[PDB]
RNA sequence: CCCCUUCGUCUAGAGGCCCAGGACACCGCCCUUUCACGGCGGUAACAGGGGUUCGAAUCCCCUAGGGGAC
């Protein structure tokens, strides 16, 4: 029963070293060896004494959960594999020329049943701790820090991107980017660390009050009807009750900078015409964003196809010329199925998503 | 008895190069095309006090806070 440090973020610490009597600046101390120098040993840190280090071995540890798997894609994309239990969530490292930026899953597997998804598709078992969240950022860090590849930078950026909703984890998500963006711990910025969410508004709310970070949407259709069908939670919280929240995240934000990235999924003849184009202008027409089109990356026995590069392209010139910034993210490391949405992991599903399937 | 303390973080520094330079963070402006959050700016430190010197982050003394040898 040895406490995991990387469960705590700073406040949490330092309550941690002011019981059994020590002062503040030790929370200090410690998290800049565990994240600054990617240290799982008090015996390494020798800006304590030897009375205090052997101490924390009696109490404490330090403990990121094991890589269990390592691919590497043609473009520079590389996917691990992390044990949580007896089950897997995934980490992808996307390498760019000035930046990299590491997708993290926030829980094992998804409650929320989007059907362009592959992590959809396996189900959900529960939601990841705290170390198990920052963990894949320090076991990242680590791995890319000590082979100094070519063109494979440290971290710069996190997207909270990989398996699973971040706003049904708040508890754990929340603390796990309070230390990617404190200076003693990864020391992020809050417009380079971006959640994204399919919209639980009460929960963006309570984000709000508890944290200040980039914010993307994953809108992914021009209406109600559409949405309801491919993002079911559309049919809990519809488009206008979640732009308006959006709304409200963006007023207290100095991370959005004013703008929210929609996020929106390009399936062929789903929502990829020319006449949804002009039907999302018109929605987005009151909500200050940006606009990042995703070619649909597949997955096995998906009902859908990708949209052609012309069907893209003609969908994001209607954009533009309503002045919108329209960005499509390139698609990193699907030879390795790490592209947005392939994370399958390695879930056992508490759903009974299975059982429900045959049963119609 | 000996070493350590420079912007929020990590550092450049060796009596005039420094009213202290850089990276990242932070803040601000812009995003009507650099985006798996992009572009450009701006604020910001010599631990504290007192000596030595024409001149101190730098040399000396004390104090506060960290290490380390007997
Ligand atoms: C991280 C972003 O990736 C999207 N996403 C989910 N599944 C897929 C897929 N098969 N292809 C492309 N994007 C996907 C999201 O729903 C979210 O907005
Ligand atoms: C694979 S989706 C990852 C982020 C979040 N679950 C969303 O839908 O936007
Ligand atoms: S898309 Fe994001 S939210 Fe919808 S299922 Fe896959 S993971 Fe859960
Ligand atoms: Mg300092
Ligand atoms: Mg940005
Ligand atoms: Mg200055």
Redesign the pocket.
């Given at each position: 029963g040895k406490i995991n440090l990387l469960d705590l973020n700073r406040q949490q610490m330092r309550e941690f070293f002011k019981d059994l009597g020590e002062?503040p600046?030790?929370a200090?101390?410690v998290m800049?060896w565990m994240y600054?120098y990617c240290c799982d040993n008090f015996d390494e840190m020798?800006?304590?004494?030897?009375?205090?280090?052997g101490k924390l071995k009696e109490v404490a540890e330090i403990r990121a959960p094991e890589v269990v798997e390592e691919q590497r894609s043609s473009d520079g994309?590389i996917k691990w594999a992390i044990a949580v239990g007896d089950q897997r969530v995934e980490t992808?490292y996307?390498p760019?020329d000035?930046?990299?930026?590491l997708?993290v899953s926030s829980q094992v597997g998804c409650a929320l049943e989007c059907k362009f998804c592959s992590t959809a598709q396996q189900g959900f078992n529960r939601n990841l701790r705290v170390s198990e969240i920052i963990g894949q950022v320090w076991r990242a860090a680590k791995i890319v820090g000590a082979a100094k590849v070519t063109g494979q930078r440290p971290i710069?950026?996190?997207?909270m991107?990989?398996m699973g909703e971040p706003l049904l984890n708040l508890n754990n998500v929340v603390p796990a980017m309070e230390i990617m963006?404190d200076?003693?711990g990864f020391?992020?910025?809050?417009?380079?660390?971006?959640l994204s969410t399919s919209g639980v508004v009460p929960a963006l709310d309570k984000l709000g009050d508890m944290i200040?970070v980039?914010?993307?949407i994953s809108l992914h259709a021009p209406n109600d009807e559409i949405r309801d069908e491919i993002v079911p939670i559309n049919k809990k919280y519809n488009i206008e009750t979640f732009l308006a929240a959006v709304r409200r995240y963006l007023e207290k934000s100095?991370?959005?900078?004013?703008?929210?990235?929609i996020e929106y999924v390009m399936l062929d003849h789903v929502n990829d015409g020319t006449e949804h184009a002009h039907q999302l202008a018109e929605l987005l027409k009151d909500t200050?964003?940006?606009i990042?089109l995703?070619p649909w990356?597949p997955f096995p026995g998906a009902p859908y196809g990708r949209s052609s590069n012309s069907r893209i392209d003609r969908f994001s010139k209607v954009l533009?010329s309503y002045?919108?910034?329209?960005?499509?993210?390139?698609?990193?490391?699907?030879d390795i199925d790490?592209?947005?949405?392939?994370?399958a992991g390695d879930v056992i599903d508490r759903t009974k998503r299975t059982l429900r399937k045959r049963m119609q």
């Open positions: 002062k600046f030790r200090d101390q800049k600054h020798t800006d304590i004494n030897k009375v205090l280090r994309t992808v996307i760019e000035d930046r990299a930026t997708a710069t950026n996190v997207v991107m990989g963006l200076d003693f020391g992020l910025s809050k417009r380079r660390v971006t200040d980039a914010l993307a100095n991370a959005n900078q004013g703008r929210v990235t200050p964003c940006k990042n995703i990356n533009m002045g919108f910034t329209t960005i499509v993210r390139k698609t990193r490391g699907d790490a592209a947005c949405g392939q994370l």
